[PDB]
Design a protein around this nucleic acid. Structure first.
Lengths: 56, 251, 233
RNA sequence: AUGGGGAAGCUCCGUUUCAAAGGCCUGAUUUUAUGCAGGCCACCAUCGAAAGGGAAUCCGGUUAAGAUUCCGGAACCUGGA
RNA sequence: CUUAUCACCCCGGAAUUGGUUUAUCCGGAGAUGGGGUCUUAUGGCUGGAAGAGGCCAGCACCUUUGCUGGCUCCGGUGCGCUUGUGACGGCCCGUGAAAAUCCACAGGAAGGAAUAGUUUUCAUGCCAGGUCGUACUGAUAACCGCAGCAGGUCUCCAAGGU
RNA sequence: ACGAUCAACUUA
RNA sequence: UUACUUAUUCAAUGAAGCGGAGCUGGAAUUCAUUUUCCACGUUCUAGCAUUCAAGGUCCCAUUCGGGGCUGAUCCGGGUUG
């Protein structure tokens, strides 16, 4: 119960991974992959826009 | 000789709506800057059943453009809208199902829903399940849009009024027979206290203009004038015609 | 230098949180502030009768400065000076039994609305200054007409607070010179001549000329744009 | 209740609305001081359940009558230091 | 301290389809198989704790009356009853409150170093926990019905045989 | 091509 | 019926982007170059976006940091319809 969570130490309320006690391993992995891949997509889209603007 | 059912309904003590299990007012987001000068991308995150309403509602999330925080909005879900989906709201949004383009932005013949009567009232037309509004035409000068309303009606409204593109989900509901006083009881016990209805001819003359008599008959004509007063307006109010129809909707 | 980098965030429509700009234009002001601004707007938007636009016709800065320098020269007595004059007069009338004439004849600016109106009626005031900021306009509307009828020079000045600090008050709404020393009579004469040329010689024309009727910024812009569209060939 | 608007008035509507609606932290460390070289917001009264939600106690013994309340033992929670 | 369904992870990569529930549902979006991780329901072993409580036998003896000794140990069964829990299926034009409160996570503000600083979310240690209710009946006699009225009045536990 | 202990509860 | 908005009425918003002019380009290709229009950094993915913002520039009585302008155009205070 929530007050038992209050009286319980931090180790039992979380996991050592990022987003430990809030999100699961699969969700964390999926959002890490999404972040990296979308950033790469944005970078390549930016350079494509730059090169087509330079051409035109 | 006594106040009648509709007269009591107006006072509305036991006739209010049962609103405990409803998921909030289903309105579009406000028209501040982004919806009229561009587009804002939101994620429809969840699709739920609104109690008392035949259509599903959509919990959607946008980013606040002025302060770091998330804004949750209660849309009326259009058919085909799925969870975790990018919807787009604004003047410059693309014509896709679930987007909130204005009428001036959508082209002729488009199918929209939850459309605004005036720009900024957050949706007033075609909100019931399976309904939609068609764009009949545009008048760019004195910017206006003629649209067709599910009653088969023509309304001319400002082009800046918005509306989510598509058709309300949950269509065909009334196609299923209720089949049971129990099903009707549950439906109206979540809607409001308006069921079952006793017939005026079955009531006493004190209780209704139709009451009384050694036979259950109305007695006088059941078509009531528009200028009639409260307690008299029982039956057919200002009926232009009457009886079984033979033809079409003339539209 | 090699450690820092160029971040710049994009402030597009749906790009990033908008910066903290100046929202002074869109402040939800208090009700009394709104009444203030909207009352001014209504006053300048309605067609004011000529009593307004003969008011709001304050005399220019240089003439106002000269008038108020002369009036500060003719400033009335204060509390301490009055007490000193009182004890001097008491001592004089107690030792020499003087007929209260030991103190010299005063030369002050006569203020107060009733007093100044009576002076105008009696033809005793040589110059009148009427504040343009009198909150109930009923009290000063008739004053230019009365001054014109009695042939006494008048000028509409800016600041009842200035008139009050002139007469050692908070608000005076009127000031009057009824007598002038011989040391600055020529300066007074030139100044009243310029005040006359500004106000009395133009009283009739200004009373004829109406004021007000000015529309707002957006309304004027729309008027100009509509006229240009109409006459565009 | 309040702001505010009705009503001759007892009082009515209204509960966030057309209101100028506001309280806690390492804190400057000594005559000062939630006045201060500082910081953020946005529920925007309150009442309403001894069957809803909810911090924490069990056993044994004991009285004419009280006990998960007393006694003996063994625990737990909250607040503070 | 140790124990499960469900769920999750690693390894190979499966039609000759396999696994599998009472209920036919999953598996290249990675099943069978092998190994492992997690939840405190629940159960087990200890501590509490046998010193308690019960079941017995014996000895003092108007003396608000006592004291000793022994035992309290191993199992088994089930469409059993009740209760709780779990994985599930059916139903809805019905999809079955809120809030207080308590945690956690993103982010990195500020602060911190050889006898001096960073942890009172690890262990142990100190103090306090105010106010009102608490008896009894709860019904063919303690409530209401003029009453010790064949009436009415909400709920918990529920042995054996047929 | 291979077999002992171990509930007893429902049908014929 | 006409070119109205300030009375009054209606609806929202934490009264945030109103009106007008300018930075940049694409046009009929300009009978001389703002003369007419437009755009004013975001659409394959249930990721993220917050410390008067990093950079730039000038000034630093130079401690464990800053100040102005910029980034983020200017004018009009009519919050918008």
């Amino acid at each position: 119960r929530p007050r038992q969570y209050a009286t319980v130490s931090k180790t039992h309320k979380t996991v050592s991974r990022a987003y430990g006690g809030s999100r699961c391993a699969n969700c964390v992995k999926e959002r890490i992959i999404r972040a990296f891949l979308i950033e790469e997509q944005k970078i390549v889209k930016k350079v494509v826009k730059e090169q087509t603007e330079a051409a035109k | 000789g006594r106040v009648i059912r509709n007269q009591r309904k107006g006072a509305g003590s036991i006739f209010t709506s049962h609103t405990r299990l409803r998921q909030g007012a289903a309105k579009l987001r406000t028209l501040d800057y982004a919806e009229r000068h561009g587009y804002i991308r939101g994620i429809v995150k969840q699709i739920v059943h609104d109690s008392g309403r035949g259509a599903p509602l959509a919990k959607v999330v946008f980013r606040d453009p002025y302060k770091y925080r998330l804004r949750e909005e209660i849309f009326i879900a259009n058919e085909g809208v799925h969870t975790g989906q990018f919807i787009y709201a604004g003047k410059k949004a693309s014509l896709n199902v679930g987007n909130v383009l204005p009428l001036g932005s959508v082209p002729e013949g488009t199918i929209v829903s939850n459309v605004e009567e005036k720009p900024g009232d957050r949706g007033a037309l075609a909100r019931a399940s399976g309904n939609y509004v068609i764009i009949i035409g545009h008048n760019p000068d004195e910017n206006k849009t003629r649209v067709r309303l599910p009653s088969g009606a023509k309304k001319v409204i400002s082009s800046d009024a918005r509306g989510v593109i598509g058709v309300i989900a949950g269509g065909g509901r009334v196609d299923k027979p209720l089949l049971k006083a129990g099903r009707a009881f549950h439906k109206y016990r979540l809607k409001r206290n308006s069921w079952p209805k006793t017939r005026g001819v079955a009531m006493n003359p004190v209780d209704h203009p139709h009451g009384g008599g050694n036979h259950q008959h109305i007695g006088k004509a059941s078509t009531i004038s528009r200028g009639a007063v409260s307690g008299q307006k029982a039956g057919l109010i200002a009926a232009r015609r009457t009886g079984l129809l033979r033809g079409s909707q003339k539209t | 230098n090699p450690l820092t980098h160029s971040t710049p965030k994009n402030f597009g429509i749906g790009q990033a949180v908008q910066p903290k700009r100046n929202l002074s234009r869109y402040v939800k002001w208090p009700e009394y502030v709104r009444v203030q601004r909207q009352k001014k707007i209504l006053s300048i938007r309605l067609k004011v009768p000529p009593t307004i636009a003969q008011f709001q016709y304050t005399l220019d800065r240089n003439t106002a400065a000269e008038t108020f320098k002369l009036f500060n020269k003719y400033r009335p007595e204060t509390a301490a000076e009055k007490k000193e004059r009182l004890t001097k007069e008491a001592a004089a009338v107690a030792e020499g039994k003087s007929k209260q004439d030991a103190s010299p004849k005063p030369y002050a600016v006569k203020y107060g609305l009733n007093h100044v109106v009576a002076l105008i009626e009696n033809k005793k005031a040589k110059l009148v200054l009427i504040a343009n900021d009198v909150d109930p306009i009923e009290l000063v509307v008739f004053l230019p007409a009365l001054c014109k009828k009695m042939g006494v020079p008048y000028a509409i000045v800016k600041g009842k607070a200035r008139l009050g600090t002139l007469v050692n008050q908070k608000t005076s709404a009127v000031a009057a010179l009824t007598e002038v020393r011989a040391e600055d009579e020529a300066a007074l004469a030139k100044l009243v001549s310029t005040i006359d040329a500004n106000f009395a010689d133009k009283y009739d024309e200004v009373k004829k000329h109406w004021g007000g009727g000015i529309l707002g910024n957006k309304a004027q812009a729309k008027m100009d744009k509509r006229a240009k569209n109409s006459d565009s060939a």
